Structure 1
Amino acid sequence: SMQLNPESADLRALAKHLYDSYIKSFPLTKAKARAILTGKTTDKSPFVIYDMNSLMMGEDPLQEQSKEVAIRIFQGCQFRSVEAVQEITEYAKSIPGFVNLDLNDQVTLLKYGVHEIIYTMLASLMNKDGVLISEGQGFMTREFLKSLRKPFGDFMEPKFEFAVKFNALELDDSDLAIFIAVIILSGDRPGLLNVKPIEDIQDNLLQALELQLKLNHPESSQLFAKLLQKMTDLRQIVTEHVQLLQVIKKT
């Protein structure tokens, strides 16, 4: 049980702040994405890329223009990944305390954070069938991405695997805003000078998260613990990504 007091009020105020910021930083929210994936909004009718024929109809710089469909698609992911770092960096700047940190720690926390957030928010854009691309204008199937020649055909599978289990938590934009902020303010990132001040902020964010998950998910056993376990999955996934980016890099 809880009480409505000044402490619980400030954690609600903190949660509202992060959501309004999330909304300003992230154009394609989970609510928007779920609406497109379930046919509800007329606004977007994404083109479905499910095979080589629809990939060609689908597209419709100069010296990285490759014949190999696998190359063009991996360059799409790379461009959107740079865009996603901008959005996350904008979000990060609205987390109370975060700019009052050593400019050094700031770039550190972001350096290891972005890949964890990308994967977290990639789940928002995914169902069983595939993933929204180009702000909900395109939809690329899981199986088409699997069909790409090795090792590109193995690139997104682990992301799909993550998303199925993560989307079963049934988190909304309010849940995700606080979760994403908890990820960024991670004490245990290599090379940080001032750890305590990052930790004191995360303790507040973890409190805000616990309060948000209790209020927002009345029918949910250990959703806080199941969410914090996911931060372990995400580390493992980044490791597997990096190892694959460095097999692709080599050949």
Structure 2
Amino acid sequence: ESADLRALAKHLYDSYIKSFPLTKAKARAILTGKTTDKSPFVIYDMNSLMMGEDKIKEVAIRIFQGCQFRSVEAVQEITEYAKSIPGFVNLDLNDQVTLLKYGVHEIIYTMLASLMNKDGVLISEGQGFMTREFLKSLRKPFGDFMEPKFEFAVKFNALELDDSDLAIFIAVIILSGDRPGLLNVKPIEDIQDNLLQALELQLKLNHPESSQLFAKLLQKMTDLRQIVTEHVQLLQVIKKTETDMSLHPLLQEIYKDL
């Protein structure tokens, strides 16, 4: 019944709003100049960077650590959203951990796109805006850290998803079931099947003139999978380049053996 899928969609959107404080709708209002929201301070060089902590350890490292800790914050919100996905907390505890371990970066980036346009990314819960060129201008290893996220976000944002779409899409991601190590795959797939049904109906209702958006959105799951695997290699590069730099353990466990 369509009715139960709508209720699932409504449930997930509600928990998404409750777990993610900077929605795509707010981020768009911030990025496009709307009077519901206030203007970000735009970091685009070192000096504007050094005025940012007024208004909102070398430069590239300082930024990379803020990105690092800003990532843990996202994992916490994602983990809290996950708990609301019906059936998730009833799964084998070890499979929960595995679903999160693998899903978290594909969801963090997917929701991260909401904060991006081709020019840069919202930072410090939308109060800041660090330009894409300033990030690309950073020293050798960190200079290329965020570029592939921007490239993805540009293509992803072209789908023009709203938060109510993303809430279901993100749940679909978490409940994959093709994740390595999963002890009991069938109840995960039963959940994902319901979510995908929910996602599909949601996209047809919310984007009726958007042909095959459902298919096109699932295909984007390929780009996410690429980003995450690409992202871990540059992590290993920096751990060996900067012996002195400390990756958060919560994040370390995410990359442990992929």
1:107-133 residue CA offsets vs partner (Å, 9 max, x unmatched)? 100001110011101100011110000
What secondary structure does 1:199 align onto?
A: helix
**Among 31, 35, 46, the residue aligned to 2:29:** 35
Q: Scaled by the length of structure 1, what TM-score is found?
A: 0.93
Q: How does 1:125-144 map to 2 (within 5 A)?
A: 125-144=115-134
CA separation of 1:61 and 1:128: change in aligned 2, threshold 3 A: closer
Aligned partners of 1:128 and 1:83: how far apart in 2? 24
Cα deviation, residue 196, structure 1: 0.1
Aligned partners of 2:78 and 2:37: how far apart in 1? 25
Q: Scaled by the length of structure 2, what TM-score is found?
A: 0.91
Cα deviation, residue 235, structure 1: 0.7
> Where in structure 1 do 4 or more consecutive aligned residues deviate above 3 Å?
none
Which structure 1 segments of 5+ residues have no match? 1-6
Aligned partners of 1:246 and 1:41: how far apart in 2? 43
RMSD: 1.9
What secondary structure does 1:151 align onto?
A: helix
Question: Is the Cα–Cα contact under 8 Å of residues 26 and 37 in structure 2 kept in the other structure?
Answer: no
Which structure 2 segments of 5+ residues have no match? 241-258
1:119-161 residue CA offsets vs partner (Å, 9 max, x unmatched)? 1011000111100001011100000000001011100000000
Structure 1 stretch displaced more, 42-51 or 111-120: 42-51
Tell me the number of residue pairs that the alignment of Structure 1 and Structure 2 aligns: 240
What secondary structure does 1:60 align onto?
A: helix
Cα deviation, residue 85, structure 1: 0.8
CA separation of 1:42 and 1:23: change in aligned 2, threshold 3 A: closer
Aligned partners of 1:50 and 1:164: how far apart in 2? 19
What secondary structure does 2:125 align onto?
A: helix
**Among 193, 198, 211, the residue aligned to 1:221:** 211
CA separation of 1:43 and 1:116: change in aligned 2, threshold 3 A: same
Question: Is the Cα–Cα contact under 8 Å of residues 98 and 182 in structure 2 kept in the other structure?
Answer: yes
Cα deviation, residue 78, structure 1: 0.6
Aligned partners of 1:14 and 1:113: how far apart in 2? 20
1:94 equivalenced with 2:84 (yes/no): yes
Cα deviation, residue 46, structure 1: 1.2
1:9-54 residue CA offsets vs partner (Å, 9 max, x unmatched)? 0000000000000000000000000000011136422110011110
Cα deviation, residue 170, structure 1: 0.3
1:76-124 residue CA offsets vs partner (Å, 9 max, x unmatched)? 0111111111100110001111111111100100001110011101100
CA separation of 1:61 and 1:49: change in aligned 2, threshold 3 A: closer
Cα deviation, residue 56, structure 1: 0.7
Structure 1 stretch displaced more, 161-170 or 53-62: 53-62
What secondary structure does 1:115 align onto?
A: helix
Aligned partner of 1:103 in structure 2 is: 93
Aligned partners of 2:193 and 2:81: how far apart in 1? 19
What fraction of aligned residue pairs are identical, expressed as a percent? 99
Question: Is the Cα–Cα contact under 8 Å of residues 99 and 175 in structure 2 kept in the other structure?
Answer: yes
Cα deviation, residue 162, structure 1: 0.1
CA separation of 1:12 and 1:61: change in aligned 2, threshold 3 A: closer
Aligned partners of 2:35 and 2:230: how far apart in 1? 36
CA separation of 1:61 and 1:90: change in aligned 2, threshold 3 A: farther
Question: Is the Cα–Cα contact under 8 Å of residues 29 and 37 in structure 2 kept in the other structure?
Answer: no
